[PDB]
Symmetry: D2
Amino acid sequence: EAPAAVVTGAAKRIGRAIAVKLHQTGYRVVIHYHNSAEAAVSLADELNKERSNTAVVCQADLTNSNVLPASCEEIINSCFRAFGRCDVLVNNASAFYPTPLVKTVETQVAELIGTNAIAPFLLTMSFAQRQSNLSIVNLCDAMVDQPCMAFSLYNMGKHALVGLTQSAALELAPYGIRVNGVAPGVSLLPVAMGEEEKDKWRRKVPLGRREASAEQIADAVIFLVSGSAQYITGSIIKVDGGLSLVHA
Amino acid sequence: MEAPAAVVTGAAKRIGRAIAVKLHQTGYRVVIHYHNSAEAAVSLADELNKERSNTAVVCQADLTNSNVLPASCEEIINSCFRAFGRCDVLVNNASAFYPTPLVKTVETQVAELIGTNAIAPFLLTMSFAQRQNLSIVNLCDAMVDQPCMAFSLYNMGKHALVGLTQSAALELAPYGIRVNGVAPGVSLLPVAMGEEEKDKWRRKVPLGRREASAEQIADAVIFLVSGSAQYITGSIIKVDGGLSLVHA
Amino acid sequence: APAAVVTGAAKRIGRAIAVKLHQTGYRVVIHYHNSAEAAVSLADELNKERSNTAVVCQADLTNSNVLPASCEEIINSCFRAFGRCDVLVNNASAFYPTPLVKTVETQVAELIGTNAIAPFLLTMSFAQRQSNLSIVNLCDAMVDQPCMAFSLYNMGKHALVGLTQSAALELAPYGIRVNGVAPGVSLLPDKWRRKVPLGRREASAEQIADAVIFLVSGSAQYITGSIIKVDGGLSLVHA
Amino acid sequence: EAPAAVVTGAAKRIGRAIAVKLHQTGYRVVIHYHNSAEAAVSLADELNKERSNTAVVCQADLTNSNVLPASCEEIINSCFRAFGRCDVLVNNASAFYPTPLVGKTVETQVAELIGTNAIAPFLLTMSFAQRQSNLSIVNLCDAMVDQPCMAFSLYNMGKHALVGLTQSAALELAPYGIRVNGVAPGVSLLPVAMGEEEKDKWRRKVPLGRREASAEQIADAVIFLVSGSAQYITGSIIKVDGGLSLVHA
Ligand SMILES: NC(=O)c1ccc[n+]([C@@H]2O[C@H](COP(=O)([O-])OP(=O)(O)OC[C@H]3O[C@@H](n4cnc5c(N)ncnc54)[C@H](OP(=O)(O)O)[C@@H]3O)[C@@H](O)[C@H]2O)c1
Ligand SMILES: NC(=O)c1ccc[n+]([C@@H]2O[C@H](COP(=O)([O-])OP(=O)(O)OC[C@H]3O[C@@H](n4cnc5c(N)ncnc54)[C@H](OP(=O)(O)O)[C@@H]3O)[C@@H](O)[C@H]2O)c1
Ligand SMILES: NC(=O)c1ccc[n+]([C@@H]2O[C@H](COP(=O)([O-])OP(=O)(O)OC[C@H]3O[C@@H](n4cnc5c(N)ncnc54)[C@H](OP(=O)(O)O)[C@@H]3O)[C@@H](O)[C@H]2O)c1
Ligand SMILES: NC(=O)c1ccc[n+]([C@@H]2O[C@H](COP(=O)([O-])OP(=O)(O)OC[C@H]3O[C@@H](n4cnc5c(N)ncnc54)[C@H](OP(=O)(O)O)[C@@H]3O)[C@@H](O)[C@H]2O)c1
Ligand SMILES: O=c1c(O)c(-c2ccc(O)c(O)c2)oc2ccc(O)cc12
Ligand SMILES: O=c1c(O)c(-c2ccc(O)c(O)c2)oc2ccc(O)cc12
Ligand SMILES: O=c1c(O)c(-c2ccc(O)c(O)c2)oc2ccc(O)cc12
């Protein structure tokens, strides 16, 4: 049959464009979501109208806790249950908010380190334990070495995700599983953000003075899972329009 | 009084101990944090106090991630203020290190490896900064991008530590607190480790075919806390004998 | 139909790159220094597929007082043949040891000239003469764990990373993207094969070219200053 | 006897501060210079008046050419001729100016910006090692090499090559006991011709104190790397940039 993929946080924005584009490439998809139940079911309905029985949703909180490993095991299990295989994992879900050094701190750690680093690691474990062109793509951050002031925990999580991309690429290569990253600079700006601030950020991008479309991020993800990336593992592709190259 | 004070985590033994000794030799009063090594911590404090009265205290604390970790970290920093009326230097040296293959429960492994290596340093950094030649030195790892097989969680935590070193340096620079790292390659080898195994590692180091002494690592810490590094923040000094330059 | 220049295109990786660009519908300049018969054989094979879509261009890419003119000429040949030049692939490369303990200045001319200076000059000519415009530079995934006694080669490849970033920044306003592909062990010039995590073998040249094709494509329209490793995980492996 | 050091471009600015700190630590120094003759002799006179016969000057163009290997050989020779040894090499000399992609010919820009920043360090490294305790080489790198100034491609190329050299040499020279490390300023002494207004624009970007590194602060990191406190450090590049390289656009 057709291969299958899990995309975490796939209801909206970049995760949705990634699930759409995998689906358009021939993949059956698990649409993982946390709070965005309506958007998720909507996407699965649209994908299923195009090719019947090719999309499911799977709800899970990816905050760190003692039950996080079971939740991650269940995300992967949902793929096998719906499609009998799981070829691609996309770790796209992410918590993102400031945690100034100067919600309790335990919750902020559980959320930002959970979603960005620990859930990826556990999903990777469960993915590998259940196992052709198998691969995992982690959504990293091109700006990880030029961080946003007061985003220590978020930054820590994405740095840990780089660590994971490298470590898992090394350890899973003998099982023919490739592990890579796509690192957006500025792509879809936060919903909460005002328009003058959105423009502040746009104007900094060398290539076009505009943020990445979700489809442009998805395009790198498609490349990495594709047959044209069969010798690529442990690589992180910046998709940032040059933004990481720009000095203060 | 007028002598500065430093907290060193995991200071009972090995590198942390050498760091505590060297700081004390430089004129610092020291909090010797420990987890299980009470006898070692106390004997070091007694030796330091014999050299100069009332210049060393111990502080016991588990740095595993949990609900209570922020309160523990707060209490470590407090201990230095209670003992010495000031806290000039934080050395995040304590570390759990053991394999976590992708293919103790896993949530415990996460708590210990990510708590000690990343979360506890972040919480100690918050408490250090909130309580204020101030600086923080984090013990990193030079081999973080060429990691040992099946050490993904340990690798994640040490990458997260780089992230913290960079984020905290940027955020704390307005308060005049510098944040840097020392990244050993192979230093003191495991206790139980066979000499034939230790030699395999030693033979890989270009500079002298030997591991760094604990004092060599401490020397880079002393530099970073010193007036000779007053413009240095966000930097990670490898102290690895060229090990990280050696291809497979 | 867009047009591409590939340097060192007569053999091995540049050949695979030329063929793949051509197969994607580019017209191609096949640059060569000493490999005339091979360049022409490739041009003949590509012109049989689609006539008048492949030309050859001779140039020495050694650093010298005339390298700027040779680089200008390479870019010119594309514009002459095809009336446009959409893609520059800096693939040509000298590779050999230069122990710290051929004259040294010839080794500088070859190893730094071919690997870094010619890419710089070709970049200037390509830019001056100017849509999906991009430059791809063939980098090296093992640049930070360099081979023993290869200082000048490593210098040249680090300089090439510097150029990829600087040019991506400077040319972004012109809509010219500048990226890198960094092979590990590809076509050898068993022990090395054994060290590679992904399948204990070298990259074929086509695997390298696949990354080049992605980077020049519409699927990479937001990508500039990026270097894609294509090394099977070799650069992750410690000593 | 006292150890001896060669500092390239040592008449003024950071190079001078490194030679002065080396000298105050007990080194004998070769003050290399290219055009700054008065400033070089003046520095050696001041250093010799502190301790006799402890400083010499040495003139050379470090621009790339077929004679550059001889000039570099001669710099290192000058240390042996003066002091009987050469313990430390500081590659500090640097040409710095824009070379936009879209007076001097391009071949001259390549020769100066690549020559001074990368080829001369490589040739001086070869000579220093071939002419051979705590031996080391320190290369002055650039903390902002990955976030480069617009239109400085050749300069950036040169400094990237210098990183490459630092790593390759550290690795190849480790068996000889020679350490090779880098110190990478962000903004330290501003260019003499830069207006205060532009200087303050750069100052204001530095997280740690909104000011440039002093020459002494750069020199302090050099001193560290040559000292017994860094006897296990090779192939490391220490940023001394007050956080500048961490600041996003
Ligand atoms: N957007 C950018 O410019 C940019 C820049 C750098 C990196 N990135 C990275 O690119 C990826 C996609 O970016 P984005 O802006 O599309 O992401 P986003 O909208 O900020 O988040 C994507 C989804 O993650 C899920 N999520 C958040 N907390 C969660 C939790 N505790 N448990 C489970 N899921 C949770 C949410 O799902 P529900 O909606 O279902 O609750 C959310 O829709 C992310 O990993 C992000 O860090 C983006
Ligand atoms: N030695 C090396 O070659 C090497 C290589 C790379 C990086 N490093 C880094 O350099 C630093 C020092 O190295 P090392 O070899 O001296 O360290 P170590 O001996 O592995 O550990 C240092 C101390 O960490 C403390 N620790 C462990 N788990 C803890 C927990 N849950 N709570 C609180 N403390 C805990 C222990 O204290 P008690 O003994 O009191 O329980 C231990 O003695 C570490 O950060 C390490 O990761 C070392
Ligand atoms: N093969 C690998 O595993 C590997 C590993 C790391 C990096 N790379 C990089 O990948 C790229 C292509 O690799 P490759 O192995 O296919 O390259 P290669 O066979 O070593 O050389 C490619 C072409 O460069 C041209 N060339 C060499 N010196 C020249 C000069 N002075 N003037 C003009 N042209 C010159 C030659 O053209 P003529 O034949 O026409 O004389 C040669 O066929 C290179 O940039 C290389 O450094 C490859
Ligand atoms: N200043 C900063 O903020 C900063 C920032 C990043 C990196 N750096 C690096 O730090 C080092 C010191 O910086 P600086 O500002 O003190 O350097 P600088 O004043 O710009 O240059 C130092 C010396 O380089 C020598 N030099 C220039 N071209 C030469 C040639 N063709 N041959 C031989 N020598 C030549 C000159 O000697 P004469 O005077 O004798 O002609 C000059 O005094 C340099 O390597 C620089 O690239 C500095
Ligand atoms: O929406 C986001 C965003 O615009 C940005 C963003 C905005 C402006 C920037 O300069 C930048 O580097 C990131 O970052 C995110 C990181 C994680 C995530 O889940 C969402 C965002
Ligand atoms: O003791 C350790 C060690 O020898 C090594 C080590 C030994 C051999 C290696 O080749 C290496 O890269 C690290 O790593 C550690 C990391 C953390 C820690 O807390 C202790 C050690
Ligand atoms: O003087 C220099 C300078 O201020 C700077 C400089 C000034 C402002 C900046 O933001 C910066 O990144 C570098 O760079 C140099 C690089 C080489 C050199 O030889 C001298 C200088």
